């Protein structure tokens, strides 16, 4: 149901300033207008703010080299294309950059995997015999490629050359304990109810 009038702009239409009582945007016809001009872009206008962040309030495309998307952990600042009212695709930050509070790396211009593969390793799940075995679940561990027996914590004599006494802690929302749990803010693996 792609209803015209919703604040979001869907296909078919091009601007959704809304109903007349709230359509402050002059670039767009009101949603309660005749169907010939049903949420259509006003004549002699270049863009509307509802189309994207690269439009001026005076219905003109924001010039090129104008910022539209902020810098992220794996994304550089987006500049307006000067030809479209939407922020174009941001150029990705370089591979393996420290991401997700240094728990992960910048892969494919996004934040996935873990820091283990930054050092040429792969991530793994540790396990303790007795005591506070929960804490280890929220502690990042790494393994050699296809060698599960090499699994060890980041902050250990093993992987010391890579992490140098850094017991990296998982971020809240990251799964743990072989997906059985999800790590919480208190650094306690938690989930899989019952």
């Amino acid at each position, epitope marked *: 149901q792609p209803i015209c009038g919703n604040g979001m702009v869907e296909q078919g239409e091009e601007c959704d300033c809304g109903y007349s009582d709230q359509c402050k945007d002059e670039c767009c016809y009101d949603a309660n207008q005749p169907e010939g001009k049903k949420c259509k872009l006003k004549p002699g206008k270049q863009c509307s703010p509802s189309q994207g962040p690269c439009c001026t309030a005076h219905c003109a495309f924001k010039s090129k080299t104008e910022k539209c998307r902020d810098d992220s952990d794996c994304a550089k600042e987006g500049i307006c294309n000067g030809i479209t009212a939407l922020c174009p695709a941001s150029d990705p930050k370089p591979n393996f950059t420290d991401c997700n509070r240094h728990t992960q790396v910048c892969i494919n211009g996004q934040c996935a995997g873990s820091i283990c593969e930054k050092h040429g390793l792969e991530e793994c799940t540790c396990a303790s015999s007795d005591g506070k075995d929960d804490k280890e679940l929220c502690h990042v561990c790494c393994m050699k490629k296809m060698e599960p027996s090499t699994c060890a914590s980041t902050g250990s004599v093993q992987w010391n050359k890579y992490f140098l006494g850094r017991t990296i802690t998982l971020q*809240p929302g990251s799964p743990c304990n072989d997906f059985r749990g999800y790590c919480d803010v208190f650094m306690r693996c*938690r989930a*899989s109810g019952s």
Partner: antibody
Amino acid sequence: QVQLVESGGGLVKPGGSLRLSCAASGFTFSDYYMSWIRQAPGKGLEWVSYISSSGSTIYYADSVKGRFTISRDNAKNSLYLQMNSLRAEDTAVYYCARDFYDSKIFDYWGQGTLVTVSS
Amino acid sequence: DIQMTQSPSSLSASVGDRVTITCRASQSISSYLNWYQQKPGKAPKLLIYAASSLQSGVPSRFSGSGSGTDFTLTISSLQPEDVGVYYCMEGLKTPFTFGPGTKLEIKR
């Protein structure tokens, strides 16, 4: 069954300190995390502390840190919550709870105990 | 700072009326959210552990729902014993935050 009984709580002068105990009649008290949540007389619930089964993990709230000293004795099946330097905003009913193997967050609760900081 | 809103706060409805309570979250809180019911003088009781999960012994009319920043508790058929104050508490991104509290009376 599960039944938690809380004792203590009363009229404490401003400042000072008070002791609070939770007795957990039936469950494997050494296999479950414990916690305290309080509610003022006319407000909502508010978490206080979260305690691991054998110590080694004792969290508090930013509004009580430096004032609340919590402890437990798995052998005696008791949960102590000592509180120091009580202010007028500590007048509330304190509830004992069990923060399960971090699942079904607080499967059971106690009836609580009122704390009055009036002079 | 995670902000927990609960709408509505006050609510009066008759027996059998369908009831919906929404817990609004400032950010994308996790699905480890549980709904609790409290009656005055007594203590709160678990209603719905995580997103859409019924606790054993709880009446089976309740049904949870929601994702992202919006969670929802649905009472299919309101009943005389459903009068009370309802709270939403999230998890895993949560210093055990409790919603403002939806009061619920009954109409007769």
